Amino acid sequence: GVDNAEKGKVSDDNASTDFVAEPVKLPENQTRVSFFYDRSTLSSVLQSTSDVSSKFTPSTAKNLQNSILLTPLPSDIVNNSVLPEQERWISFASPTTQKPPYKTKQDWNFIMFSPFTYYKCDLEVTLSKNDRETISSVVRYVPCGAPSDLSDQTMPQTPSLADTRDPHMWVVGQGTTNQISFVIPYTSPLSVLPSVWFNGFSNFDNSSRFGVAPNADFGRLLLQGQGTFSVHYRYKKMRVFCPRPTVFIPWP
């Protein structure tokens, strides 16, 4: 029937309003935000060429660092930063092809579908070795905004990443299954994280990169030991706020 869209909202009708029909609703709850995001999606990749018992040193190789910034949003080395920082845009890895892979790390599924302005959740991380060679790796988890501590070994032949009280994981041997998984709590000093854009600066002299919020992440993952590892994120107890537009899709 008639209505007035200028009001800001119109009724949600079913066939019975205008015609001789009945509602046809069937129970369903797979559309709940918590359920939808509570599943692992590829969100990053990591690579290391140094052994376990050595000093961890930030490195890049064909767009792959040996450390990661835990955030579904695009992250990568920004303007020669020591470690990956959150990006404001995505770029192709190749300077020619004009086709993916991208050089930036992110949860494609989150970026392509995040119809909200802010979000809150815990993060379940999964780290998998890309080949079947027996794993031998040490990973260090650093809470959001905490010191990276990229120091020297304090003792000979020991993994420097394990030389911390920070949560760290150590997997090695033919009894293992070449993967690691764990869940970390929301650690940002912010109440909720911006899911897409942050209309502001992060410092008092407004010199930072406009668009990036301060400490908008779940911490970082530093890795040492041989191999390339893919990373998955699973959003636990996911909560979203303020509906907003989805990424535009080219017209068919």
């Binding site: 007035n4 869209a5 200028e6 009001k7 800001g8 909202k9 949003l73 695009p74 990006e87 404001r88 845009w89 995505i90 770029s91 192709f92 300077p95 004009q98 970026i111 119809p115 302005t117 802010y118 912010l190 109440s191 909720v192 994280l193 911006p194 897409v196 854009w197 942050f198 209309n199 502001g200 600066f201 992060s202 410092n203 008092f204 407004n206 990169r209 406009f210 668009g211 919020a213 908008a216 706020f241 303020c242 509906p243 907003r244 537009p245 989805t246 990424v247 535009f248």
Partner: protein, 258 residues
């Protein structure tokens, strides 16, 4: 008839005779509660600051196309001298928390055609897009002086030179305007109403805002249907807005910003 509406705020009052009601974003209102992140007792209930600040926004011509828009960064749009006591108090405080009560005005006639989308959006990019230059403190939170085109924001706008832009398919400041209607809004249809009334609560990444670094809310007026009229009809069609900060609370009193 039931479309005549008056709204008082301090020593100001808006009046319309074609209202379609007031839309409350998220069905919430800023109640004026003090931020639990501040120990100092906030300064609040300042009547001289809880009023409507009216400003001219833009001229609507036949040249504007669907989705061309004007942005109004908040609270910055009122952080200037014309922000009265709201401004003078804001400039002398480190933090500010508030909602917004807004009415945008625009009249034409029974013989004009066209429509605008009036909406409020949190974390809506207000930076300048007519350059590849990094946004700065004095260029990031300004009320648009000219209508913004729409094409250059669908996939965002990277602050990089034109040749690099080729290898940058998407920027986080992207705005799929085809869905701008998902933001708390109202429509100003020339045949129906000459005013839109909105109100949104306080939302942000934290309890209260260090406003000097962040414009969390943005009032946006975009055309949905281009302006049309025949020879003889009034050609000057302008858009205005009355903006009221809802129960603003201030913390961290200090010397003023310049």
């Amino acid at each position: 008839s039931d479309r005549v509406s008056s709204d008082t705020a301090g020593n100001t009052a808006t009046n319309t005779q074609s209202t379609v009601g007031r839309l409350f974003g998220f069905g919430q209102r800023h109640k004026g509660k003090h931020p639990a992140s501040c120990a100092d007792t906030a300064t609040d209930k300042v009547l001289a600051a809880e009023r409507y600040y009216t400003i001219k926004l833009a001229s609507w011509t036949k040249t504007q196309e669907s989705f061309d828009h004007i942005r109004v960064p908040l609270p910055h749009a009122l952080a200037g001298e014309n922000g009265g006591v709201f401004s003078s108090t804001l400039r002398r405080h480190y933090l500010c928390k508030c909602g917004w009560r807004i009415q945008v005005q625009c009249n034409a006639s029974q013989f004009h055609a066209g429509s605008l989308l009036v909406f409020m959006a949190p974390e809506f990019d207000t930076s300048n897009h007519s350059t590849e230059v990094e946004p700065r403190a004095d260029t990031a939170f300004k009320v648009d002086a000219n209508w913004q085109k729409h094409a250059q924001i669908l996939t965002g706008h990277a602050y990089v030179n034109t040749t690099t832009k080729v290898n940058v398919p998407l920027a986080l400041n992207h705005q799929n305007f085809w869905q701008w209607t998902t933001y708390p809004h109202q429509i100003l249809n020339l045949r129906t109403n000459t005013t839109c009334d909105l109100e949104v609560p306080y939302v942000n990444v934290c309890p209260t805002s260090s406003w000097t670094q962040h414009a969390n809310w943005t009032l946006v007026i975009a055309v949905l249907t281009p302006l049309q009229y025949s020879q003889g009809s009034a050609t000057t069609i302008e858009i205005t807005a009355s903006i009221q900060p809802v129960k603003p609370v201030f913390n961290g009193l200090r010397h003023t910003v310049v």
